[PDB]
């Protein structure tokens, strides 16, 4: 790409930069945050006006349209259906299937436009936004239908013009509106637009409907009745191509030339010289370019004028000649001060068979990659793209699908569709999917569980860890320690599980009880993720055994937690205090040996407190409560030891 010598489209932001304020910006995942800044404090004004507004610039307003949301879900179902079917069909069956897939995309576009039309009639303030969206979707369906005919159906000489007449008829409805109004008149033949309705049907190749209008004139006007019969016969005899005839293009051309000579003979004989409108219709049947241009207002578009010219001058036109006739029709139709519209460049490129130029022009004109992504995907299934990797290692199909899918990831409900588009991107799709999965705003546990299922199905172990760590941190900020611990265990983050376990132990030291009992009781094998979580789970098992009156097992477990050095030194007082009720029981629960181990753990802690105390903090009130607790422990240990020695000595006889 030569760098585009196109001035970048300036997006004026109303109210931003009023008063020589500097603009600050921050890029989001698909949005630009803009804010005003005071970049230079020269002057102590403590009254510097707060930046009152933060602007969110969105590149894709269309992604948020409720109606276009249906377009994206239905088009995704068509896309995924196409990709799954790519292995099953060969030759002519495949072509018919791809034309059917093309028609399914156009049917979704049409249904979205019909819904927008019904909504526009109901709501005056949003009507203008729906009218502009209907115009864009109409231009998309127009150009898509042309691409279906030229590339997917690859229409040969003969069937091509039939499909172009059908194409104009599906996209230019003005003649039918004129004829409906003429027919609602009490006297259709006296209506100002009556001959415009006749001429408009002839321009569209609708000879039978033109003849039905002429039959009304032949009934009303006794003087015109002879001329109406000649014109009805000319319209009836007009050779038409049929999509299943045994007729050769050469046999058609000879019949068409003979019919044209019959029209010309009637004109030269002055058969119509008493009725200017019948004479004009006969000149239209001869392909008279002056009269076709005089009827510009009935055709409204240069491409309707093209198809009318092809019908009456070149009915056997080849695909290779279409661009020449299209260019000539545009130049003749635009021969005043009117510049070609961006849609005209798209349609001309399609008639040139330049698919790359069609894609390029639509990528400039469209806010959304939807058209270019799905059209390019469907044309790639037609084998119309050579496997030329772009300089960046992806092909054009994959590039457009990646950008389209990235667009869907910006939206809170559509990011799930973007996942499946990335799975059909062979080179970069997986790396894009990893990057976008980590950036998803996790506002709810339900959304996180959906994202995790998607990552787990695709073996994305790092993204699973990242999502679980993010949810664990959010749960921790929300003071939900059990939820935070569960998410940390699922992340397999031993350091984060330790940090949460230390907060549970601190909350127990402050409150005397655990907040989330049921989760700690069900840790199972996940208890082994860290030494601190092991301590927390075993210390909870002690409280459970104590509540079940299993005092001997509880005492042995409590002792094992101290001797194994898995308890944090800050918590050793609490463990020794929880041994007090067991030491004071009437029955000897701790043996003389176990009581000596508890005495050792108490003295090891008293030694550690003497070493950590720099001399200057001896004077705040926490030292006395701890000393009373230690004296109570020494008394309970001495009383248990005296009882244990008496009971053990009495069992050794």
């Amino acid at each position: 790409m030569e760098e585009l010598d196109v001035d970048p489209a300036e997006t004026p932001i109303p109210g931003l930069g009023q008063q020589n304020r500097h603009i600050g910006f921050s890029w989001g995942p698909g949005d630009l945050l803009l804010y005003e800044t005071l970049y230079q404090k020269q002057g102590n004004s403590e009254t510097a006006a707060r930046c009152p507004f933060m602007y969110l610039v969105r590149s894709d307003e269309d992604i948020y349209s409720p109606v276009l949301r249906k377009l994206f879900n239905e088009s995704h179902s068509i896309f995924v259906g196409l990709q799954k079917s790519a292995e099953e069909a060969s030759g002519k069956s495949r072509k018919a299937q791809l034309v059917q897939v093309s028609r399914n995309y156009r049917s979704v576009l049409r249904a979205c436009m019909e819904e927008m039309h019904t909504l526009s009639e109901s709501t005056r303030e949003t009507a203008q936004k729906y009218i502009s969206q209907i115009s864009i979707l109409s231009a998309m369906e127009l150009s898509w239908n042309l691409c279906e005919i030229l590339f997917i159906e690859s229409a040969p000489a003969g069937p091509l013009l039939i499909l172009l007449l059908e194409w104009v008829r599906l996209h230019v409805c003005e003649v039918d509106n004129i004829v409906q109004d003429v027919l609602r008149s009490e006297k259709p033949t006296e209506h100002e637009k009556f001959w415009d309705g006749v001429t408009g049907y002839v321009l569209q190749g609708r000879m039978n409907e033109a003849r039905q209008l002429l039959a009304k004139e032949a009934s009303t006007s006794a003087s015109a009745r002879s001329m109406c019969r000649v014109l009805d016969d000319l319209l009836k005899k007009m050779p038409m191509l049929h999509t299943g005839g045994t007729q050769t293009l050469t046999e058609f051309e000879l019949k068409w030339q003979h019919w044209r000579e019959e029209c010309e003979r009637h004109l030269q004989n002055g058969t119509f010289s008493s009725n200017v409108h019948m004479e004009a219709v006969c000149r239209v049947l001869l392909g008279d370019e002056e009269v076709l241009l005089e009827k510009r207002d009935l055709m409204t578009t240069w491409y309707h004028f093209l198809v009318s010219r092809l019908l009456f001058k070149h009915p056997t036109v080849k695909p290779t000649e279409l661009h020449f006739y299209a260019q000539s029709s545009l130049d003749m139709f635009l021969a005043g001060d009117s510049c070609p519209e961006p849609l005209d460049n798209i349609l001309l490129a399609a008639f040139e068979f330049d698919i790359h130029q069609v894609i390029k022009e639509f990528s400039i004109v469209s806010s959304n990659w939807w058209f270019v992504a799905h059209l390019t995907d469907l044309l790639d299934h037609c084998q119309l793209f050579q496997a030329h990797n772009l300089y960046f290692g992806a092909n054009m199909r994959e590039f457009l699908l990646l950008d389209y899918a990235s667009g869907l990831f910006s939206h809170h409900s559509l990011w799930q569709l973007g996942v499946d588009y990335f799975d059909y991107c062979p080179n970069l799709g997986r790396e894009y999917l990893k990057l976008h999965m980590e950036r998803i705003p996790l506002s709810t546990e339900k959304k996180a569980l959906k994202a995790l299922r998607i990552c787990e199905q695709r073996q994305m172990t790092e993204q699973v860890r990242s999502i679980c760590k993010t949810m664990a941190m959010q749960s921790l900020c929300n003071r939900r320690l059990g939820s935070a611990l569960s998410w940390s265990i699922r992340a397999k983050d031993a350091a984060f599980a330790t940090l949460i376990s230390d907060r549970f132990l601190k909350e127990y030291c402050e409150r005397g009880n655990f907040t989330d009992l049921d989760l700690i009781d069900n840790l199972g094998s996940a208890m082994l993720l860290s030494d601190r979580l092991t301590f927390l789970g075993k210390y909870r098992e002690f409280h459970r055994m104590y509540s079940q009156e299993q005092f001997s097992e509880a005492a042995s477990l409590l002792l094992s937690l101290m001797t194994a050095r898995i308890a944090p030194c800050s918590f050793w007082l609490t463990l020794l205090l929880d041994a007090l009720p067991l030491l004071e029981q009437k029955q000897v629960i701790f043996s003389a040996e176990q009581t000596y181990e508890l005495m050792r753990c108490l003295e090891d802690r008293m030694a550690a407190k003497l070493e950590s105390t720099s001399p200057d903090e001896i004077q705040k009130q926490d030292s006395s409560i701890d000393n009373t607790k230690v004296e109570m422990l020494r008394l309970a240990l001495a009383r248990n030891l005296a009882r244990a020695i008496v009971t053990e000595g009495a069992l050794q006889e």
Partner: protein, 375 residues
């Protein structure tokens, strides 16, 4: 079977769908339902009518698109929704708020009738926590949340009547009434918990769980006629059936979905039928009625085939009205299982069933409605 559901695209994700309760004395079919949204820039509660235009033609395929009657903005996601009565809808919010909306049929509008803006919050930080589930037994309302709290309200009381602080140390996902004063909750550690709302303590009366690895339980429903029979769904897509009088373990564990099970509901008036929906985009109908062919005591017929499953059941419980859902006999419990939706929706987040009518809401920004469930 795809021809049974009218599909309505609504251009926003549907988190919850509920039928308006009909009068038990009316032969009237339910024609009105409510929906809640989630993950939209502006979330809302909507009321919808199913179209009844009088097809006196026994042979025209039902193409009655649901029509939106009215809507109201909802702060944050609609995490749960229930009708309190014909005029009132209760919602749990991702903001931790519980809200009662009143529907005004005469002008087709919604209004806030009452709100509890701090129903759910984390102790010590006073940060809002999502209200994850709500249940109604008019005029009583119960809510649960990610803060592990249980709140009791009455629709006419501005104050919370009771809070059970620190009821769970984990996220509660679902709540249902076992009885007028007893609820069941399900949580993120795979426990079903029974609560007596009159008990002054914060401890559950009973705790139930699977043996071995515990997965989150997302949904819970209670059999309408058999208060001891409970269904739950979880993260592994499994349907669990419980007898809350008989042990702490499920009675049955059934493969139901390939992903998270979002809702389970017994049919309110025909509880031999049960419905489940999932993240996998499926909506299943479970039929246990195959064993309701009255034992016509006649005649004998031999034949053998072995397949091993371990169950230790002691041989003395009276033949009192076997709930089809509790039948352990592999020769008698033929559950018919039918997927009601065509293959390939996004997540089916919610279902509700009333009479011959089923509604469900999806992440495909679509509502599906049938009025001929069993036809």
């Amino acid at each position: 079977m795809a021809d049974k559901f009218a599909a309505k695209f609504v251009s926003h994700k549907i988190s919850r769908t509920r039928w308006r309760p009909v009068s038990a004395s009316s032969l009237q079919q339910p024609d009105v339902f409510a929906t809640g949204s989630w993950d939209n820039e502006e979330n809302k509660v909507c009321v919808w009518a199913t179209s009844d235009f009088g097809a006196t033609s026994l042979d025209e395929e039902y193409q009655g698109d649901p029509k939106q009657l009215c809507d109201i903005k909802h702060p944050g996601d609609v995490m749960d929704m229930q009708f309190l009565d014909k005029e009132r809808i209760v919602t749990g919010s991702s903001t931790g708020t519980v809200t009662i909306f009143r529907h005004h049929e005469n002008n087709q509008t919604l209004s806030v009738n009452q709100r509890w803006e701090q129903a759910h919050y984390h102790v010590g930080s006073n940060m809002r926590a999502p209200c994850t589930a709500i249940v109604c037994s008019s005029p009583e309302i119960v809510s649960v949340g990610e803060d592990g709290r249980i709140n009791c309200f009455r629709a006419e009381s501005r104050d919370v009547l009771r809070t059970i602080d620190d009821a769970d140390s984990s996220t509660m996902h679902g709540v249902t009434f076992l009885r007028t004063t007893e609820i069941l909750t399900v949580n993120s550690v795979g426990q079903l918990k029974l609560w007596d709302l009159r008990k002054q303590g914060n401890d559950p009366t009973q705790i139930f769980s699977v043996t071995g690895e515990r997965v989150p339980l997302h949904c819970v429903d209670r059999h309408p006629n058999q208060q001891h029979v409970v269904a739950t769904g979880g993260q592994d897509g499994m349907l669990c059936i419980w007898d809350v009088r008989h042990g702490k373990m499920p009675m049955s564990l059934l493969n139901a979905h390939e992903a998270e099970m979002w809702e389970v509901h017994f049919h309110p008036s025909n509880p031999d039928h049960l419905f489940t929906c999932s993240e996998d985009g499926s909506l299943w109908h479970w039929d246990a009625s195959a064993d309701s062919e009255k034992p016509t005591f006649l005649l004998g017929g031999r034949s053998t085939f072995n397949i091993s499953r371990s169950s230790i059941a002691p041989p003395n419980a009276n033949q009192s009205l076997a709930c089809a859902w509790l039948s352990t006999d592999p020769t008698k419990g033929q559950l018919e299982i039918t997927n009601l939706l065509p293959s390939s929706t996004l997540s089916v987040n919610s279902l509700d069933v009333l009479g011959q009518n089923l509604v469900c809401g999806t992440d495909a920004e679509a509502i599906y409605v049938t009025r001929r469930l069993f036809s």
